[PDB]
């Protein structure tokens, strides 16, 4: 019962660790150690695969360091391969990369830790910035799955991972209301966005930003300042520790699988035997049920991808660009090592979002006798009108229509309106004590939900398209609210009834 | 200066495509194409790579055509990695090259032909639009991203002017457990006449088995089969229900020559697509190693003048996944004889099939009518959706042609409105039958001439058994 197992490591003392781990797992059941090396040569990588896996019973490989041809030549025959030192989420793609093992999850798993960060103060107000990477896209689908089950989260902000001049997003962020924001990008894009939003003062008080892990580097603090808490999985990852954990759990696995039924032998090096691969998925599917309560780094639990569940994290304070542990997520519970969080404005507390809104964008349409639009005088002052009792009717300066012709170079005409609505909203501004923003539609549309002639879109137009796109806080119009209006919006109760 | 080393893996013949037209037709003859035909019988990958740059030891190719007579989508990703590392444009032909997984490889310069699963989705809804049948049930397993496909098809049925309502929950990953409890719990709520399909095939055999042990297979449902469930052509399982229908590419028109002739007629003249810039032709290399060692200077979209080409009127435009935007698709019924019997085709938003009469196998009845306002009023189908998309029945306005030949499908796409439309609706509601409703095109009610037949009365008394 002699079992051979491959390995790809960059250090010969780690090959000595591999041989010693072979001797340690030999305490049960016999093991066989084979050649361990490392190549920056993809041709020589796959060539060494099917010139050195010409042994019949090489059952597993532990590789080390980017993608690689051995993800393809060994991803067919089809043995489990333990990736150790690369963190691509492309290996999580179980379409092609189904037959691989990784100890640590790749960067996608930080979204659950950020949901735990939400649960730390049980807060809601958050905006995310997401780069245009399909790995980051898949992590975005993962966090959307994490949200579907509360959380306020305002919107996702899209980023291009090769662009600069993010100020077009930064002014939008100035218009935004949630003060808490986490970045999801690499550190080189973080150079641009940290220096730009610090230039554009989107630190708030120094509190606004938060950090993940992949943008943490040496230059990362030559950017975004102190107080802005980052994270890391496991500090000082001993590769020998992961070696010992993997060898212990695979010793458990080989004493499981070697007491089983008929097992096909793996082939012998890319020649003649391109017909036998089912044994790999066979003992891999049985091996995925194995678990690991032991471990020098602790107990190891497998997800669907075989990554270690119930991991730890170093929640980091930034005392003058330091990484001071204020807590650890102990598998299921965040266990705090609580120190003072600075947040350089001084947000040492649980501020729990924000308190912003007193400005109300009001996009309207003229309608007799509800709205009586009337242009102002030459100075923008309204032509003052009285009632039948001589009392001055209220006319707030109506702006917004940049078109009367539309088709000609019109201006945003300064008018002012009067009706039920104007005195009504002025009473409501006395009532709720907000401030007031007049807007109108230059084309003058309610705007119906027409089907767009492209692929499967039925989109509101006009005021409904604007409030759909968030271009209005308030729409005041004669509105017979249908089901399609009501299924998207909030609205207070109607008050007038007609036919 | 165009080297295309012809690669054959399997049992096919070399005289299927001689050069024999590449020298002759019209080739703007300053481009000098060169070929290298070879035929293999093994799929050994180290032999493949040593074949690659023992072939590319003869430097003057840099891009081949290749036919591997296997299933092998793993090698269809491996050659994407090969065009990603030893970067060159290639084109796939047959077998493992037709079976395309189409994952994201930004540095593979290699595209193929083929239909997308969204293109298959569009035709699989277009046939349901054509026969006015409504989707109520897809079955889905876990095999990757089916969920995005059903998101797209779900937005489509949201925005196809009719809410063709889905069943409740369709993912049943029963490969993890026994699953039979939730199999019966899901199959209890089924209210469809039709079942659309996931990707897997061994689970298709197993789910044929669980539909047999539930009682689903007989004639209350029919199945549309995309590729990767059909897989190989000449294999049918034993738990296979009667009357499946496959959709794939037209392999009876594609297991052939004169399509790699189209491929080389794209590769040459794509040489002059690049030479329309007068781009200097990149030097072919004795290679596998120095070509990714110099630089990756060649990685700037040479194929952008290649995915927008039209040869002999055929728009050969390659979609960005590695498929073609305009494939040729076939409709083939899997019969009770386990036989692959072609229903028809799809080409350019038209379902080029044999019969409007879809074949089947006492609910079915036989019915004829003649137009009479206001019993029967006018017939014009609204082309907003292409079918009569309001509240009235196709009366089967019969086709007519020149009398030198038959040319009788028997139907022009025209509905009918009136009293007897509602009468037929109420009587199909009360009695729950089906009908073969026609239109009298052979005269009026009719005057019986010499005792012989006349009209509507004639079309019934002609023993067509139609009910007037």
């Amino acid at each position: 019962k002699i079992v051979n197992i491959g390995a790809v490591l960059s250090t010969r003392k780690h090959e000595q660790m591999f041989r010693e781990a072979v001797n340690q797992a030999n305490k049960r059941i016999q093991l066989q150690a084979t050649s361990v090396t490392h190549k920056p040569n993809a041709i020589q990588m796959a060539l060494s695969v099917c010139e050195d896996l010409i042994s019949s019973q090489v059952y597993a490989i532990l590789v080390s360091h980017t993608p690689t041809p051995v993800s393809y030549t060994a991803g067919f025959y089809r043995i489990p391969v333990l990736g150790l030192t690369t963190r691509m989420s492309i290996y999580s793609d179980k379409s092609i990369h189904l037959s691989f093992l990784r100890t640590v999850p790749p960067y996608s798993h930080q979204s659950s830790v950020w949901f735990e960060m939400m649960r730390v103060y049980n807060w809601n107000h958050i905006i995310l910035l997401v780069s245009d990477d399909h790995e980051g896209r898949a992590a975005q689908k993962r966090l959307e799955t994490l949200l579907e089950e509360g959380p306020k989260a305002e919107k996702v902000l899209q980023f291009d991972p090769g662009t600069k001049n993010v100020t077009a997003l930064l002014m939008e962020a100035r218009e935004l209301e949630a003060r808490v924001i986490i970045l999801s990008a690499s550190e080189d894009d973080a150079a641009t966005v940290y220096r730009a939003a610090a230039m554009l003062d989107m630190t708030g008080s120094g509190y606004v930003w938060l950090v993940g892990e992949r943008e943490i580097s040496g230059n990362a603090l030559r950017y975004a300042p102190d107080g802005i808490i980052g994270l890391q999985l496991i500090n000082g990852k001993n590769e020998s520790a992961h070696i010992s954990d993997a060898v212990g759990v695979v010793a458990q696995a080989v004493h499981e699988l070697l007491e089983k039924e008929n097992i096909t032998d793996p082939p012998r090096g890319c020649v003649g035997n391109t017909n036998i691969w089912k044994t790999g998925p066979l003992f891999k599917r049985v091996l995925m049920s194995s678990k690991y309560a032991d471990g020098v780094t602790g107990r190891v639990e497998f997800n669907e991808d075989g990554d270690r569940k119930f991991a730890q994290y170093s929640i980091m304070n930034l005392q003058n660009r330091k990484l001071v542990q204020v807590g650890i997520y102990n598998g299921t519970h965040v266990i705090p090592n609580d120190r003072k969080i600075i947040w350089p404005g001084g947000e040492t507390e649980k501020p729990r979002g924000y308190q912003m809104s007193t400005r109300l964008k009001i996009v309207t349409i003229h309608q007799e006798p509800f709205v009586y639009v009337k242009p102002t005088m030459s100075d923008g002052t309204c032509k003052e009108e009285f009632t039948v009792n001589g009392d001055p009717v209220k006319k707030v300066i109506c702006t917004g229509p940049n078109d009367t012709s539309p088709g000609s170079p019109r201006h945003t005409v300064p008018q002012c309106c009067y009706g039920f609505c104007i005195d009504l909203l002025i009473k409501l501004a006395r009532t709720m004590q907000f401030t007031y923003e007049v807007h109108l539609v230059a084309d003058g549309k309610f705007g119906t939900q027409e089907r767009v002639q492209n692929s499967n879109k039925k989109e509101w137009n006009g005021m409904m398209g604007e409030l759909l796109s968030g271009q209005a806080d308030m729409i005041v119009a004669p509105l017979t609210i249908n089901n399609e209006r009501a299924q998207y919006i909030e609205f207070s109760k109607p008050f007038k009834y007609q036919g | 200066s165009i080297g295309i080393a012809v690669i054959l893996v399997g049992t096919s013949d070399e005289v299927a495509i001689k050069d024999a037209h590449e020298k002759d037709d019209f080739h703007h003859l300053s481009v000098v194409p060169r070929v290298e035909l070879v035929a293999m019988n093994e799929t050994d990958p180290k032999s493949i790579i040593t074949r690659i740059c023992d072939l590319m030891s003869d430097r003057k190719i840099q891009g081949v055509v290749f036919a591997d007579d296997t299933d092998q989508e793993a090698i269809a990703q491996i050659l994407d990695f090969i065009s990603a590392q030893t970067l060159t444009p290639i084109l796939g032909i047959h077998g493992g090259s037709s079976m395309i997984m189409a994952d994201k490889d930004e540095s593979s310069m290699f595209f193929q032909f083929g239909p997308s699963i969204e293109q298959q989705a569009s035709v699989m809804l277009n046939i349901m639009e054509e026969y006015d049948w409504y989707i109520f049930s897809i079955v889905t397993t876990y095999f990757p991203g089916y969920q995005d496909f059903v998101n797209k098809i779900r937005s489509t049925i949201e925005n196809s002017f009719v809410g063709w309502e889905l069943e409740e929950v369709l993912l049943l990953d029963m490969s993890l457990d026994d699953g039979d409890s939730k199999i019966q719990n899901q199959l209890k709520k089924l209210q469809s006449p039709i079942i659309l399909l996931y990707c897997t095939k061994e689970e298709a055999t197993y789910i044929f088995e669980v539909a047999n042990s539930v009682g689903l297979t007989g004639y209350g449902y029919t199945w549309i089969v995309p590729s990767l469930v059909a897989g190989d052509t000449d294999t049918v399982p034993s738990e296979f229900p009667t009357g499946l229908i496959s959709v794939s590419y037209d392999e009876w028109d594609y297991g052939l020559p004169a399509r790699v002739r189209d491929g080389i007629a794209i590769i040459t003249t794509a040489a002059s697509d690049m030479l329309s810039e007068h781009s200097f032709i990149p030097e072919p290399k004795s290679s596998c190693y120095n070509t990714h060692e110099k630089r990756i200077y060649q990685s700037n979209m040479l194929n952008r003048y290649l995915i927008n080409v039209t040869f002999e009127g055929r728009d050969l435009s390659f979609s960005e996944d590695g498929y073609q935007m305009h494939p040729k698709l076939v409709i083939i019924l899997l019969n009770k004889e386990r036989k692959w019997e072609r229903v028809g085709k799809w080409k350019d938003k038209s379902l080029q099939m044999k019969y409007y009469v879809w074949p089947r196998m006492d609910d079915h009845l036989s019915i004829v009518t003649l137009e009479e306002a206001p019993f029967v009023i006018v017939e014009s189908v609204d082309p907003l959706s292409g079918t009569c998309m309001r509240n009235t029945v196709p009366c089967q306005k019969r086709i007519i042609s020149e009398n030198k030949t038959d040319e009788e499908p028997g139907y022009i796409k025209k509905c009918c409105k009136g009293f007897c439309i509602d009468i037929l609706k109420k009587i199909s509601k009360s009695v729950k039958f089906t009908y073969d409703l026609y239109l009298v095109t052979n005269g009026k009610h009719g005057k019986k001439i010499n005792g012989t037949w006349n009209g509507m009365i004639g079309e019934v008394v002609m023993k067509r058994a139609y009910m007037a």
Partner: antibody
Framework: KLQESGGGSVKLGGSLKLSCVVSGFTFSTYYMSWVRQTPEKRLELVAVINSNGGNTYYPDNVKGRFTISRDNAENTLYLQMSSLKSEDTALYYC????????????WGQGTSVTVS | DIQLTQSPASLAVSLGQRATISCRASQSVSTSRYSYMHWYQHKPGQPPKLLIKYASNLESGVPARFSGSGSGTDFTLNIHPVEEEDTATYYCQHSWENPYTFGGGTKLEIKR
């Protein structure tokens, strides 16, 4: 690197041959161009040759008029001109391949050709 | 080749400012993989050195003040400090098929 020669004050449609002085690299592996720089400061590409003369291209006011000679043993580029116009008075600062390099790469100091 | 326009064709700016030179093509030029801009600056008597390689891909040997961007038809060059060595005429060539097509071009001087 690059230096032009053979250009000067010339006349109408007889002959003129430019000569690109070449030093400091491998000339036989790069792509060539022709580099009319007008006194109105609006550049025109006259012609292009490859590393072995197997790929030339002329625009409409170039074909029939001007031809390229290209030596790799000498490493010297040439532009044989014929049927010149007074609009063809321009400067020349040649440049080489930008490694698939639609644009050119490798400017040196050059010459001026004045057709008068 | 896709035709360009270039604006402003002459510009005098003061020192330290963020000088922006717009370029407007006629059509969309390239893909997400790369772009077409090859920017060139020099003076009369100077040869034009490459500044930008695709649209923001910077040629080596270029000081960090110069920074170009843009896509489709919109294209720009931003020089966020203006210094005394920046007086040069600026040109950008490209090829959808023809490697020399310009806009109107521009010459950058210094406002004093």
């Amino acid at each position: 690197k690059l230096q032009e020669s053979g250009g000067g004050s010339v006349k109408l449609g007889g002959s003129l041959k430019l000569s690109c002085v070449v030093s400091g690299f491998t000339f036989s592996t790069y792509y060539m161009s022709w580099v009319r720089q007008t006194p109105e400061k609006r550049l025109e590409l006259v012609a292009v040759i490859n590393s072995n003369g197997g790929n030339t291209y002329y625009p409409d006011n170039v074909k029939g008029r001007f031809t390229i000679s290209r030596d790799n043993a000498e490493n010297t580029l040439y532009l044989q001109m014929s049927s010149l116009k007074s609009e063809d008075t321009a400067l020349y600062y040649c440049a080489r391949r930008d490694y698939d390099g639609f644009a050119m790469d490798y400017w040196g100091q050059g010459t001026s050709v004045t057709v008068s | 080749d896709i035709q360009l326009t270039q604006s402003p064709a002459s510009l005098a700016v003061s020192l330290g400012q963020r000088a922006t030179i717009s370029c407007r093509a006629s059509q969309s030029v390239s893909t997400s993989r790369y772009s077409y801009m090859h920017w060139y600056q020099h003076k009369p008597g100077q040869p034009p050195k490459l500044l930008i390689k695709y649209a923001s891909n910077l040629e080596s040997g270029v000081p960090a003040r110069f920074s170009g961007s843009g896509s489709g038809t919109d294209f720009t060059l931003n020089i966020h400090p203006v210094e005394e060595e920046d007086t040069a005429t600026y040109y950008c060539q490209h090829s959808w098929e023809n490697p020399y097509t310009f806009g109107g071009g521009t010459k950058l001087e210094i406002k004093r």
